Every structure is written in structure tokens, then in C-alpha cells.
Amino acid sequence: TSDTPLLDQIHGPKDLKRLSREQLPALTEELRGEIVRVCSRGGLHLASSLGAVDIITALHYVLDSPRDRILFDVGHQAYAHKILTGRRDQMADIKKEGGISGFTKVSESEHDAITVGHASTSLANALGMALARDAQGKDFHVAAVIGDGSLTGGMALAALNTIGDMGRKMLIVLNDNEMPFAAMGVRYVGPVDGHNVQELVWLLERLVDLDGPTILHIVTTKGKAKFDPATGEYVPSSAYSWSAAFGEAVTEWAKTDPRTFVVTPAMREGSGLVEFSRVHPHRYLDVGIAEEVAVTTAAGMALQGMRPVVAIYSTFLQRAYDQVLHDVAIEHLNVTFCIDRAGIVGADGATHNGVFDLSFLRSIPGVRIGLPKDAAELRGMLKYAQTHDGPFAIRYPRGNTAQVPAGTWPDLKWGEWERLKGGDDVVILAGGKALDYALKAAEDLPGVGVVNARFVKPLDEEMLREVGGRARALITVEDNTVVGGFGGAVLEALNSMNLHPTVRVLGIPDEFQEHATAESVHARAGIDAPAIRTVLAELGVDVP
Amino acid sequence: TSDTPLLDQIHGPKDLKRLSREQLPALTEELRGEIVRVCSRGGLHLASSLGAVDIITALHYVLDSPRDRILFDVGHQAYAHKILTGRRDQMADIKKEGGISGFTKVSESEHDAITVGHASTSLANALGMALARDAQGKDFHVAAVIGDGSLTGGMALAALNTIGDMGRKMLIVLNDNEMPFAAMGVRYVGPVDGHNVQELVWLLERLVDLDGPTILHIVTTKGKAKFDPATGEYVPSSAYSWSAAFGEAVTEWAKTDPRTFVVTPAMREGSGLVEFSRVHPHRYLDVGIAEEVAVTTAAGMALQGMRPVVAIYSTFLQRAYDQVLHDVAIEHLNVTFCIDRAGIVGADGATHNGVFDLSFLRSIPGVRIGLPKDAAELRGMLKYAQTHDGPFAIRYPRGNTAQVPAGTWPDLKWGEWERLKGGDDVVILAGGKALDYALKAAEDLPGVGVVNARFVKPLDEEMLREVGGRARALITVEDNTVVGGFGGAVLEALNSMNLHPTVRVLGIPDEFQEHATAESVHARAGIDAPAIRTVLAELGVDVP
């Protein structure tokens, strides 16, 4: 009577092994149907997880998780893994607050061998587990599932070199859905049909106990209102994403400046560069999932007179920290960073929240940092960055902004804030996403000033000296960690001016933020409009 | 009458081309002699530069620098490059303050195509220059010299993938001195004799104008008081490097704790692990020049119950920022970081000064940060780190400390500072290298307290509340940038306690520090003993 008679009896991998191999194809058909029925919601990596159903079924049929360790790279392809490991009932609330993560998470289950979200980490983790295993006299199996895209990552390729050097027992499954390792010293098997679960089982049985590292190359298939040219995605009629504002802006700019060259690390759609790549094909570069290569290639362009734009998510820019510091900042090169997904991104959780860029970028000499309040101010920053010396970073959140007409290119002096609401008793300093909350919080409140602190590096020391000298209390708000971010920048400046007003630093706490909506995270962090109103009341302002 | 009749007439590459090819072997003999005579000083990469004399001679004989761009990876092997490009007279003062850099530097000469010091950047820079070249209608040559070691770096391997993808004109010389690229899509030539300058010229002439990227694989030879078991180097009889203190410490510790596993990214000697690798061969790992792999492999060990120790220089830890954040900190893993070369390192200049770790580590949740004042306190921190949950970082400078007897393992509570000199009027907060200056500065001065702020994360909030509440002024000193470091941490804590004393944040300015002794840099930065005395006088303390 049920659509999934086999899955209904499978509560874990030890129930899976009770089936016959001839029943595994029928199980893979149930798993694809289950993934579609429950995970056809918005913003779910449906195609990748569907493509990996057969390899995950065969791995759990052959190996003995949780004693055997199965590692997924990125982790977006492991919905069938979660379904087969006692989390079938939780798939309906995946990525929701209080539910299971969209990626594998060590805290979530003994079956999740690594916490992942960033790509290319599985191989180095697997090597560490294999080395620890041999240092403990144990012989459990270590297996890693890495896609063709993740394999291009630098830390995946380097780890391959070391894995072939140590010669320890481990299995690497290359999940290749885009339709050689002799110098590494690694056993190579394949390519084989990545959707033949019975054939996959046969192979894994006869590979998983061999000596030394092995790569099993499998081939799988990817996925077995108003239009937006930037992201190539249809959006609400009223919507206008920051990614789309950037895409339109840089597409316009490049029409008049042939020095502009846009580099992305395999995120053309997310960063909003679909239209750009078609209008300016001689000025668009995709370096794969290698943020390190994106920034240093841009530096090489800047050395030869170009004005490169690195489009990159805040969380991924973390991968290129040293390239920003060493390859860009030391010679003060003309690299512009347009940083999408700044701040809390929400449902993707701790591995993707970009709440650190105002901290690690700020400590790099010469790197200017700006936060636009709307699309016009984004274009002003982009125009300034593309026409002045040295590196500039422009960070904006995931979300929408007001659409601006073409040809809007204001002139702004970099480093100048702007007062948005009069008032000198309590003054709130906030830029970007935090500024939305601040204006909302102090909307009616007289004497509560609001300043668009749209530049984090440098600060507007003139306005901060004037405001800090006469304000009773200051409130800094940032979609960033409170440690070493915009709040710390204000305190460093005030102290060096020997100004000592009361200051309340509002931001993300020194704690990783689990998956949940950004509105929920900002409410619990204390930066949304009601929480700012609470701080205003603790400071003695009459709040309703 | 002169030892170098040929070199005496060579003031630049256009004079080199006037020679006959039969004179090039004699020139390479002059260049080796010149490098030995002038660069046989202390701490110079003599062997690497000697090994690359023939390839550098042939490249400059064939190419037309500065219009042609020759890129060196790391840059330690390019002494003959500097000699052939008008800097022969400056080799006597190389790495000295006011002299030329030990590596290539764009600011130094039009012949230095990239500023380097960290490894594996040449390939991505070369790709950017080649892309910029083609985007400008120009046809100059782009050539990169990368060693076998640098080629194992992740960003070198990933860049190789993209270089083979773009198919642009460029030459990569693999300088292989440690005695395959079909999937990349790159032309492969070699291996050839890397010391046959005439044969090298012949090849470069017939390769440098071909289409697409080419790899020229050459084979070269590496280098054509009391003993210290840690670094394997003889040192002054009274000396005792921090690297040697760490090596002895972890060698002792691992004898009693089999969970301890030491990972280094190809810096066994510098980190002081020569003896360790011989006493504990089943607990020592070398991952090549891949800091990214070192940290994530350690995370994989920590997931399997081990207590890994990542030994790594502060400047190189910058390469593993995201791996510390994403792979270690998110699940609060038991990874201990022993961070050598913390602070200003001196003669190696801007590419090596480790003055950022107290800033980028501090913004990562759960990462504890300690600064030992001597070897006993280092062992106390190492013992604490290896027996408590979560990640810990321990940073120490290049330099010497007092030698401690074996079996010294004090118990310290992590997060507790210690008052070293009484006094409550002005209190100086300083740890590690900065604490040496502070104790020196306030040695005789009564009422000037000195606190060993040996923990940056967390701060000793109890002592800081007491001291900040009653002190007239505070002075924070750190061998770190003043932006977001220990000074900012103190200000963030004081502000959240609503304590507003006068504070002077002393540290490295928000500017890269050129090559010079650490004593000179600290004097100009304002953290040495006389500069602290100057700050004490500006605060009203009677100073001699």
C-alpha cells in the first residue's frame, strides 16, 4: 500500500545490509522519489543529491558506518545518506531552525564524519582519519566522496599528493557529473557507470580492502515575476537582489572602461554575472572553485595595468586571506573585491555565514572597506574603487535593494560617512544591512541620530570625532562578529582621540550561528530593530 | 686582471645579449663565484640561487626584460637575476635596512615582475599577466620559474589547471632539484640538464614563441657553540631558541601521550622538529608546502581522538585561515597550534613578518590564544592545550629564551594573567616579546605596574576589570598590528565593562614593515623599551 515498502523497513545501514543486491535498484528508485517529494522545496541542492543516490546506497551496503567513516565533500549531495542513517523523518525540516543541516554535521549524527560546507576538505580530513586510524591499531574503512568540481580545489589537489605519499588504506570516490594519477602514486579504477548500484557494490567489495589509496572514478548525471539577467533566475516582480545590482553595475562600467576584468571562483550565477559573461566575454574569467587562484590572478592583472574585479562570497573570501594580504596588499595593487553574501546568510548555517570579512580585511594594510546602503551608493563605491589606487572591498548582503536607472554613477569621497537622521544625544553608527535596522529602530525617536557609517576602512575620523565628542552615547551595529570588526574599529579610533563616550557594540556574538533565517539570527544576536530599541531604552531614551 | 671580465661589462640584460653563446658557460662560472663571494653571509639562500644560475642566464639571454616578464616563485633563487639586472653593486647589503630585498620586489626594479616571499604564487600571477597581455593586444613573453617544492602547493596546482584551460602563451620553468600534465592540457618538455646554459638557450628559443602554455622541466643540483637537536643547527653556546624549547617540549610530551601527533608544512628544521621526527617517527607528518593540508589533516586526526600539534610559522598560518575557521573551529576540535616566528621576523621583510595572527585568530570563535614569557610557561600552555577541549594557539617569536630542565610541566589556568611588578598608577599589559620591552621599560619606575598578559583569548577579565577600574592609565604592547589585535581586545573588554581609563595601544602600525632588524622595526614602531618610556613620560611618569 506504501510507495516505499523497502525504505519503510530501513532505519539505518544495518537494515540496508539485510536486503538482497537485486533489491538495491528498487531501493534507489524509492530514494529518488523520496528526495523529490520532500526536498523539492526552495533552495535545495536537489540535482546533486539525486545524482549520488546509487553510490551512497552502495557505500552503505558495503561499509559499516559509523565504525567505517564515509566523508562527503561540501555535503550537498548527501540527502540519501541522511535518509539511510535514521534521519528520514527529519528531511521535511532540513535547513530549518531546529531541524537538520543541509550539509553533513558531526554534531548531528555519528554517521556524519565531517562538518562541511566549503569544498575540497574531504581529502585532507580523510588522510588525518587514516593516519589516526593506523596510529591506533585499528582497521576501519575510510572513504571520501568528492565531486569533479571540488577536485579542482587547491587543497584537494595538494592533499592528493600527500595521500599518494603516505600510502595508507583509503577509498576516494570521484563523483564526476561533467561527462591520470600515476605521479600521485594512487590506484586508479574507472571510469564506471555511477548509476549501476549492483555493479558499484561489486567493485567496492573488491577494492575497499586493498592496500594503499584508491580513486574510484564514477560518472553520474546532474539530477537523475520578472527575469533577472544577472543571476539568470526569475525573481519576485518587486525584487531586485544586490547580486543583480552588482551585475548590472559592472556590466555598465565595463562598457566604458576596457581595463575592467571580472574574476569569479565558479559562482557566476550567484554573484550575478550571467549577463556580464555574455556582454563582455573577453573580460570574464572563471577559475573554478579556487578562490586562491582568483585573487592572485587578479593581482597579476593589476600588475599589468588592468582593473580586475574579484566577485566572491564573503565566506569563500576566507579561503584567499593570504592572497589578499601577500599578493594584493603588499604592493597596494588595483584589485576591487565585490563581496556578496556579507553577514548572516541564514539557512546555510555556520559554514556559510559571512560575518568575518569586516574583521580579517580590516587588519590588512591598505585595504579599503565600504558598505553600500543602496544600489546608487554601490555604483559610487565601484566607480571610486575602479578609478583610484590600491585595493578596495565592497560587501553587501544576500537580499534586495531599490533598482536604480542606468547611468547612475555618483561621486563620493571614500572615507566620508553621511548623517541620515538628525540628533546628537544618542547616535547610531551603522552601514549596509545593519543600517536598515538602525533607521527602523530610531525612525520616530527624536534626538537619536543615525549616521550611515558606509566606510569601515578608513573610518570617517572627522565625523566620528565630532559625534563622539558631543554624543552622550554611541551605538555601533554591524552584520559582522563583534570581535575586531566595525565596533572595534570605532573603539580604536575613539581611544586614540582620547574620547570616552558610552558605546554599545551590537553585532554577531563570538559564536558560530546555526542554520535559521537571518531575521531569527539577528533577533537573537541583538541587531534587529527591536533589539536596538531595547539598547536605546537601557540608555535612557523613551521608547514606546 | 679582474676575476669577472665578462660580468664587469654586464650592467643589464641588453649587455648580456652582446655576448656569444660560447661565452655563457664562462659567465655562469663568474656568477657562481660572485654569489659565493658576496652572499656567503649568515642566513642567505645560497644553495638555491647557485642552482638556478644557468636557467636565469639563459632566460635573460633569450628574453627581453623588462618588456618580457620573468616571474620567480618565492624569489630566494634569484640572486643571479638581481646581479644581471643592474643590482650587482647592491648584493653586499641585501636584506639589510636600506638595501635590496632578499626576494624579488616590484618596488625595487622594473625587472622584478612580482613581489614574492610566500611560495606557489608565480603561476596565478603569470596567468593574470598573460590574460592582461592578451586583453591589451600585446605579445610580450611571460615566463615563470617555480621549484619542485613550490609546485606541490595547492594554489600552484589549481592555477596549473586554469592555465591549461585558458591556453594562453606562457612558459613555466620547473626548477627540479630533488633529482604528467596531459590532463592539464599543457605542453611538456624535458627533463633536461638544468646546468647546460647553451642547451637551455637553444631550447628556450624554440619554445618561447609556441602557442599555449609550456612546462620546461629542468633538473638542477642543490647548491652548485653547542649543538641543538631541535633545529639541527649549531647555535651560540648561551643561546636557546624558542624553536628549540618547543622541540624539546613536544618531544618530552609525546613520550607520555601517544595521542600527540605533530604536523609541519615542510619546515621541520625551522620549527625545531629534527629531533622529534627521529624520536617519534610514527607521530611526525610533513605535508609539503601546503599549510591548508596541514591544518585540515590535523582536524581529521582530532576527529578520531588524537591531539595533533600543527607547527607552523605565523606568516604561513595566514594560508590556512579558512581551514582554522571552517575545518577546526566550527566543531571546536582538539588542534593545538604552535606558532613560530610570531611578530616581526626582521630581515625577511614584509612577506614574512608574522604580525597578524593576534588579529585573524582572535576573530574565530573558540580559538584560544596564548603568549608564553619563557620556556616553562610554554610547556604549561602546551600541557593545557593538549589536555583540554577545543583549539589552542601558542605564538612565540624568533629568538632565544632561558633553557628549562626536563620534566618541567607547570599547571596554569588558561585565561589567567599574572602581575609581574607591583604598581597601580600606570599599568602596562604585555605578553611574549612585548613583555621583555615592558619589564625593561618599567624596571626601576615605582607605581608603574607590569602585568604578563600571556593570554589574548580569552582575556583575564577579572584582573582587567580590577586594574582598569583603579589605574589612571593603561599601556598595551604587542608584537602585532595595532588593528584588531591585543590592544583592540583590551578596548573591547573595557568598553563592555563601561570602564574608561586612558589607554595607549602600542604595536606595529597599519603598514607593512620593510626588511630590517627587529630591533630597528620595533624602535620605529614604538614598542621597544625607550619608546615605552616616552609614552610613560607623556602620561606624567618621571622618567630619567
Ligand SMILES: CC(=O)c1sc(CCOP(=O)(O)OP(=O)(O)O)c(C)[n+]1Cc1cnc(C)nc1N
Ligand atoms: C554547495 C556550495 O556552496 C557549492 S557546490 C559547488 C560546485 C561543486 O562541484 P562538484 O562537481 O564538486 O559537485 P556538483 O555541483 O554536485 O556536480 C560550489 C562551487 N559551491 C560553492 C563553494 C565555493 N567555494 C568553496 C570553497 N566552497 C563552496 N561550497
Ligand SMILES: CC(=O)c1sc(CCOP(=O)(O)OP(=O)(O)O)c(C)[n+]1Cc1cnc(C)nc1N
Ligand atoms: C624561502 C622560504 O621561506 C621557503 S623556501 C621553501 C622550499 C621551496 O622548495 P623549492 O623546490 O620550490 O625550492 P628549493 O628549496 O630551492 O629547492 C619553503 C617551504 N619556504 C618556506 C615557505 C612556506 N610556506 C609558504 C607558503 N611559503 C614559503 N616560502
Ligand SMILES: [Mg+2]
Ligand atoms: Mg560535479
Ligand SMILES: [Mg+2]
Ligand atoms: Mg627544489
Ligand code: NA
Ligand atoms: Na584600485
Ligand code: NA
Ligand atoms: Na584541545
